[PDB]
Ligand binder design. Structure first.
Ligand SMILES: [Fe+3]
Ligand SMILES: [Fe+3]
Ligand SMILES: [Fe+3]
Ligand SMILES: [Fe+3]
Lengths: 512, 384, 162, 512, 384
């Protein structure tokens, strides 16, 4: 023609000159405290340009929505899900949502940290991706509230999450863990350990367990989140590459990595086993098998082995984390069910097939956990007229529930089959409780990082139903609780049934 | 094969046996408690407001207690201490265009693919044959090229806001405001890369525009102001406000709209206007968000209007002076233009358009007394 | 035999090959449309192949017309050297003067057998279609259901086999 | 900056001036023969411009594909469909496709006919809609060939089509009747009858039988095709408004409407009923109920009633259509099955449960059709070693099958429980077979419009398998036929199995 | 409620038991018999080729026998008799760009929604302030406004080809070439409607542009060529070839690219270029289909190349004179511009760009011996 059609468009032709976009001036430095220097001339793996990033994601979106809005709505997919998994997805989607959201702020910090324009560009794509993911996890709760069998909790989790104890630990690994500290510590929490060891495996596993329990909404969304996650693990790798030639790495990198690994596994080993095994009806695989493949073999072995040439070693706490893995999820669900009035989701006792499954996969589950669940059932924990909440059994059998001060995981050392060591200290007029040597060192070395009030400190001397009423843990009839000790549509507990119990929180540390 | 609970007759039978006769709650609106800006809620609000886990001690937050892990020394994950502005509710802001992530990447993807179709058209049609050579290889290659670094600088000025924003709605607006600034910088380079394919011997390398930005004189004070707004402000609202309601509103609007948009047509260039129509669409979009936050939520805050307006006035004076210097130095570029391209009467009128629009849209909104004749006279001092 | 490939089609391809001049090719095409085309054809012996054989005869005549005629004649004359506009105007005046639907159908058929492209330029021929078809339909569709079938069979001149 | 943002030049603001875009010049007239004059100030009902048309459709597309590509592929919805319905969709999709396609050209002709800009513009949007619809029906065969249980026939129906007698009838109502013979007569076959009476009810009814039989692909596509169809019905209505003040309508309109109604119902009354009742396992309702609601009540009653003020009346052939309707589809399936080697799809005998269902809804079905299928079954009609095709039964019991000359529908007047009319005429050395007097009148008044060679005339003297081989009626392997007399996966029929029967076509008319 | 065979346990159990063990045929293509233009069959081709039920007696058809219902008089539903061109196979054509309705309405939708955003940006930015009022209220309102009718007539010249085209691939290209022309006609009116909203006293009514088109001297000869191409041509290919490879290739290109796109930037008009950028992208997208059909498929046909090149030469010669007359009258418009806008040296240069682009892209393909100097001299006879 008069010449022919070209374009440049292709992001690679423009990306070739990105990197030269940054210039030197005194004060072109990061605004954040850090022990490390990220090299300029750090290159990035994906040759993205803003416009092409947008096109790349828009294509994924139109397929995702489109399936959700036409076909799955016509098939009534929101309704035809096992009641237990409908409940598990309130936690899974809203809690993942906070991690998606704090990963926005986190790679804003890392974009600031980086001096290379390409590395800044790598973390910029992830800023934007974590905004996509925040609205995707919100859209899963949006759709199940709109179209599912129990919208309570899916519709208001951003405010009803605040009533219960498991929310605090989620905030430590996936909110504060991602943004508060040295930018590289945050990066090891988020990208090196968080996304590569747990989020990338989990999003795919959640999809399998979803598919088995009738859910085809969560595969539509989560399989689209997963197509982004590889650029995010390229970013973590690149954080290490950018700091590997600095003297500071050989002094500090493996300690920030070990503390980050401990942080993440501490919450995820018991919580993810608990939601997979106790929150499904159809079971895919035992968590003991899964954890070992994910943590020990794939991450600890392969992913970290790829970084050994940059001076990374496998965390020195990997062994301790594997000795508390087997029982920790079983241990935790006893406490989560015992504290069922403070959640925003309905919970069910194991049925006889599940107990048979648990006992085949965990020899000795029944004599410990099985017999307590049977005694709670007989005492009448599912029925409102019993006057029994399992917390009462912990009190009448003197089994204190402590909250860790660092990770915020609840633990009950007198009952636990897991590695449970209570450490209690008083410092400057306040008592603090720890569950393990790693969190204890973190607090001892860094007390002013770990000042979070726990559930018993804040609720002390308050009767349970007035906490629930104040923090709005109620269905739209203003009477029946969101959160139930059974997953059936009949004999739902109401605020008055809780008021009858006359259950008043006490701080467990006042007994020392 | 994997059996799926939705389609497998055994598994589905078990699932169906367990379902309730009707939904356990009739309230199926996922953000029912938010407080709608527009009477019926909106998907942008339900999917966005209250994703930030702020406790009540950061105004508007619904959670309670401290952060679980803070910085070494004690700095909070987010806190009141990161900005001077104060408010009754940080979740009050609403982007007027209601943009959450899917419509934002949809619009930009559209623009991207029609950019691709338009360049294929433009080169197949052979429209560079009517473009002035001098304009192309000097003003376009070097002075429009140099402006890329000003837009990259403004993009980077958003890094700290992206980490420190005190709500979900302010974070998502900020982030989209910044991503549009790097997009425009990458479009400046795309255009030079296109001309390198279409015009023999045109060099797409950034060395000549970069040397103009770092060592030339037309952009000296522009670069000094961008350097300072990016790396010297540690308050995330001071950067957002000062980049968008003072510097880019004055210098950026003058350069983009009243210099290159106004004069590239005169040299037979419809190529640079194609990319500036994007740049000006994005500036007008972000403006509605910046006025909503700074004037509708902050400046008109029920408890803090007087306070916030005092502080925003202080920053307009702080940054109006380096912005005038940026303009004043850019006035030197007209001397480099072929004679009779423009005249003093046209340059003056274009400066008054930029100042009066800024007074209308930003300065009057916080009651900042600007003297239009003084700003244009100070700027015109650098003209010949 | 064969639907699409058979001895009948082969035989005609072979004789269409060998027409070396326009006037002979067009004579053959015209004669072919009287003999094997429309319900007024002279025999139904080629019913299974005549549409295909006709297309092949058209190709040949079109090629030879284009080589023999200059540009204005290609646009304005028929393959027999008549002025296309004159033939078209005469046929429309004929059609317009038709006493009934019986007369009208013979004028419109007949025109198509004689003048179908490449005999007439298609611009002239489809303008013929346009005008000719309107009058034939106005005459046929008037009081369409009023003649009883027993009478219409006789008017058409059908042999009632049932 | 200075002034408010308007785009506010929405499609209506531009459409307001569209009527003035046309201008007068002596030759500004249709290029097509017509008896009617469409008025030049005709308005249209949907105020669209090209760009907004395109946006309005692209949004439907994203939903449509996206469901097909993510969730329906992952649910493997292409495979989990009843055998029978997979074969029905080879016909329903590819035969609807030819109607979609010829409707492009039909509304091209109508855009040429209308002189009012806005009338041209409404036909233009139908032009583009029918292109959309051709690619949508094509997409459905494409998805089923790519992902279903039997791709043969779904993958090549544009040429295997050509072997059978039912295709010819489809071409008469949805190809030729849409584009040949007065633009208004074509408009009445396409819009006022074709779409308003048959296609637009048919499309939702196909989605209802599709979903009962496990098909979720056809619902995804045909329900977005359906969102366009009201605009097309409005075009039929405006065709009548545009010609209603011309004196030519009082003479001609009800005759072209009567003819169009008889054209369209002659093929669709037997064909759609047969496809629904014999092409499904799970039944929604009997065809006699449906045909009565759609043709007599909805169309004949309410649709046409709206046009009475334009001098439109119910077709004088409506009562004949209703008396011939009842057994019509039953009589045709005997024939489609007798000629099963000529198709591109697999047919099944009625099973015992649906013989009971036919019996319950059509008293007398068993003593006539059930008895005959049982005899055919006893003779081994589905087993290739039997050496029997049901066509042999018609020959030995002396029941000739004839092909109309006008509608192309096969009829066997000596066996039919429905109409038994047979007229054979000889004219100019050729015989012609008719099955009703509406069609006999059309040939008699218009002989040169109806010269279509039928299957017995073309295949006369040819052995069955030579026709099938020549016209590619085979599966890849070059042996097994696409067509089958059962729907099972084993003991499929082969070319040599048909060849052993030395079944040679004979023209039934040569017995006179 | 309403049970569905995919998810209902009892029904799905029945369907699942009737299924075969593997697909009864392994060839899961669709269109596997189509000869691919590009090595692997594309989705465009699978969903489009052989959708038209032509019998073997219309070149390339796969069916057999006559049509079942013909016109009164015997005219066939599609026949060889509706065009002078002949080919070995009417299904040979491929749209380079491979458009099958879903990509096509996808792209145009991107253009509609980006137009909307652009317009809201432009009006809010206040860019009309820099636009010359004589250009605005006269050359855009009346002369650009009048070109609308030229695009609408060229759109309308496609109606018959939409009915008469002889294959699926030609008909889908033809339809998209015509829909883009009504789109342009609608975008010239959209521009006038935007201007009426932002400029007090601008009348968006088509009365003034229409009078210009029907009674002015400048577009006389253009309107007569359009009236001819639309309603006096009955061959569907003569229409599409003469509209697209002769008339719009010389006159339409001159007006769009060489008058309005060249001169509107000189008057501070960046608005009209936004819409002419759509018109030139469409012109170039259509050109590729036009060249494949008329040159690669018909012009280079193995049996009929010499025949078809003779008829296309004939049609180029027939319609080059109305085209030159259209161009000639249009030169009268330069006399209306403000003095100093253009001179004869620029105009002569722009004319030769149009003529040489046409000789390269179109005339040379069929060996039409065109002489550039005599064509430009002929047109230059109307300039003063
Ligand atoms: Fe994420
Ligand atoms: Fe991530
Ligand atoms: Fe359709
Ligand atoms: Fe339709």
């Amino acid at each position: 023609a008069a010449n022919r059609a070209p374009t440049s468009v292709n992001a690679q032709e423009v990306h070739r000159w990105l990197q030269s976009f940054n210039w030197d001036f005194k004060n072109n430095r990061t605004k954040y405290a850090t022990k490390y220097k990220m090299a300029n001339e750090t290159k990035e793996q994906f040759k993205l340009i803003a416009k092409e990033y947008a096109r790349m994601e828009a294509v994924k979106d139109e397929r995702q929505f489109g399936s959700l809005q036409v076909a799955l709505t016509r098939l009534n997919a929101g309704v035809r899900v096992h009641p237990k998994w409908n409940e598990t997805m309130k936690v899974v989607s809203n809690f993942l949502e906070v991690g998606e959201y704090n990963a926005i702020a986190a790679t804003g910090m890392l974009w600031d940290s980086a001096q290379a324009a390409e590395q800044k560009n790598g973390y910029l794509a992830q800023v934007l991706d974590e905004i996509r993911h925040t609205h995707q996890c919100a859209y899963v709760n949006y759709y199940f509230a709109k179209n599912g069998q129990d919208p309570a909790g899916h519709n208001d989790a951003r405010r009803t999450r605040t009533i219960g104890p498991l929310w605090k630990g989620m905030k430590r690994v996936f909110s504060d863990g991602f943004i508060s500290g040295d930018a590289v510590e945050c990066s090891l929490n988020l990208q090196l350990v968080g996304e590569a060891c747990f989020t990338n495996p989990l999003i795919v596993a959640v999809t399998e367990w979803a598919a088995a329990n009738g859910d085809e909404i969560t595969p539509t969304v989560f399989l689209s989140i997963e197509t982004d996650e590889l650029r995010h693990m390229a970013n973590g790798y690149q954080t290490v590459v950018s700091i590997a030639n600095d003297p500071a790495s050989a002094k500090y990198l493996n300690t920030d990595l070990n503390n980050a690994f401990w942080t993440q596994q501490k919450y995820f080993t018991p919580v993810l086993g608990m939601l997979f095994e106790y929150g499904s009806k159809f079971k895919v695989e035992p968590w003991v098998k899964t954890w070992d493949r994910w943590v020990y073999e794939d991450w600890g072995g392969i992913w970290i082995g790829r970084l050994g040439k940059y001076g990374v070693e496998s965390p020195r706490s990997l062994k301790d984390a594997k000795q508390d893995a087997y029982w920790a999820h079983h241990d935790l669900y006893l406490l989560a069910y015992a504290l069922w009035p403070t959640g925003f989701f309905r919970l069910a006792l194991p049925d006889q097939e599940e107990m048979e499954w648990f006992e085949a996969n965990y020899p000795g589950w029944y004599d410990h956990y099985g017999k307590i669940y049977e005694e709670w059932r007989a005492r009448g924990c599912e029925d409102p007229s019993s006057g029994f909440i399992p917390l009462m059994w912990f009190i009448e059998n003197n089994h204190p529930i402590y909250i860790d001060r660092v990770s915020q995981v609840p633990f009950c050392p007198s009952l636990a089959k897991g590695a449970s060591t209570l450490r209690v200290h008083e410092y400057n007029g306040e008592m603090h409780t720890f569950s393990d040597q790693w969190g204890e060192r973190m607090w001892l070395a860094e007390p002013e990082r770990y000042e979070c009030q726990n559930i018993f400190e804040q609720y002390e001397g308050r009767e349970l139903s007035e906490v629930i009423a104040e923090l709005h843990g109620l269905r739209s009839d203003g009477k029946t609780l969101i959160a139930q000790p059974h997953v059936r549509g009949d004999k739902l507990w109401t605020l008055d049934d809780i008021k009858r119990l006359n259950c008043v929180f006490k701080n467990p540390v006042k007994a020392f | 094969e994997r059996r799926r609970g939705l389609t497998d007759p055994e598994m589905a039978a078990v699932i169906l046996k367990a379902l309730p006769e009707a939904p356990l709650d009739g309230n199926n609106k996922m953000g029912y408690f938010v407080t709608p800006r527009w009477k019926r809620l909106t998907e942008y609000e339900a999917l966005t407001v209250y994703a930030q886990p702020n406790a009540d001690w950061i105004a508007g937050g619904l959670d309670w207690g401290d952060w679980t892990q803070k910085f070494h020394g004690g700095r909070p994950s987010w806190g009141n201490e990161t900005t001077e502005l104060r408010t009754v509710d940080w979740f009050k802001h609403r982007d007027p265009l209601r943009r959450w992530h899917a419509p934002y990447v949809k619009d930009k993807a559209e623009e991207w693919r029609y950019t691709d179709r338009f360049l294929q058209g433009y080169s197949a049609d052979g429209q560079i044959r009517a473009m002035n050579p001098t304009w192309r290889t000097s003003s376009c290659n070097r002075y429009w090229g140099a402006f890329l670094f000003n837009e990259y600088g403004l993009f980077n000025a958003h890094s700290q806001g992206a980490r420190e924003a005190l709500s979900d709605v302010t974070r998502v607006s900020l982030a989209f405001w910044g991503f549009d600034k790097i997009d425009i910088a990458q479009m400046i380079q795309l255009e030079r890369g296109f001309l390198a394919k279409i015009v023999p011997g045109f060099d797409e390398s950034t060395a000549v525009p970069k040397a103009e930005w770092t060592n030339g004189e037309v952009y000296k004070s522009a670069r000094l102001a961008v350097e300072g707004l990016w790396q010297e402000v540690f308050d995330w609202n001071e950067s957002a406000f000062s980049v968008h309601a003072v510097y880019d509103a004055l210098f950026g609007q003058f350069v983009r709209r009243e210099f290159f948009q106004r004069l590239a047509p005169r040299f037979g260039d419809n190529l640079t206007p194609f990319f500036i129509n994007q740049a000006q669409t994005y500036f007008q979009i972000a403006k509605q968000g910046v006025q909503d936050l700074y004037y509708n939520c902050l400046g008109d805050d029920p408890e803090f209007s007087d306070y916030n307006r005092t502080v925003m006035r202080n920053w307009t004076g702080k940054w109006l002076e380096p912005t005038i210097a940026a303009l004043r130095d850019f006035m030197g570029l007209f001397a480099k233009l072929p004679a009779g391209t423009t005249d003093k009467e046209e340059i003056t009128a274009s400066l008054y358009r930029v100042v009066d629009d800024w007074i209308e849209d930003y300065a009057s909104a916080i009651d900042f007394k600007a003297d239009r004749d003084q700003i244009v006279k100070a700027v015109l001092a650098g003209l010949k | 035999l064969g639907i699409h490939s058979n001895d009948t089609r082969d035989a005609w391809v072979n004789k269409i090959a060998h027409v070396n001049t326009l006037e002979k090719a067009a004579e053959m095409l015209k004669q072919f449309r009287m003999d094997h085309t429309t319900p007024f054809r002279n025999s139904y012996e080629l019913d299974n192949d005549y549409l295909w054989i006709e297309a092949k005869l058209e190709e040949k005549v079109a090629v030879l017309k284009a080589r023999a005629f200059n540009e204005v004649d290609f646009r304005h004359k028929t393959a027999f050297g008549e002025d296309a506009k004159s033939v078209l105007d005469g046929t429309v005046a004929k059609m317009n003067a038709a006493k009934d639907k019986w007369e009208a159908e013979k004028i419109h058929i007949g025109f198509r057998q004689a003048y179908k492209p490449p005999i007439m330029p298609v611009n002239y021929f489809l303008d013929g279609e346009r005008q000719l078809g309107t009058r034939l339909m106005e005459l046929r569709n008037l009081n369409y259901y009023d003649t009883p079938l027993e009478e219409l069979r006789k008017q058409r001149g059908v042999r009632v086999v049932h």
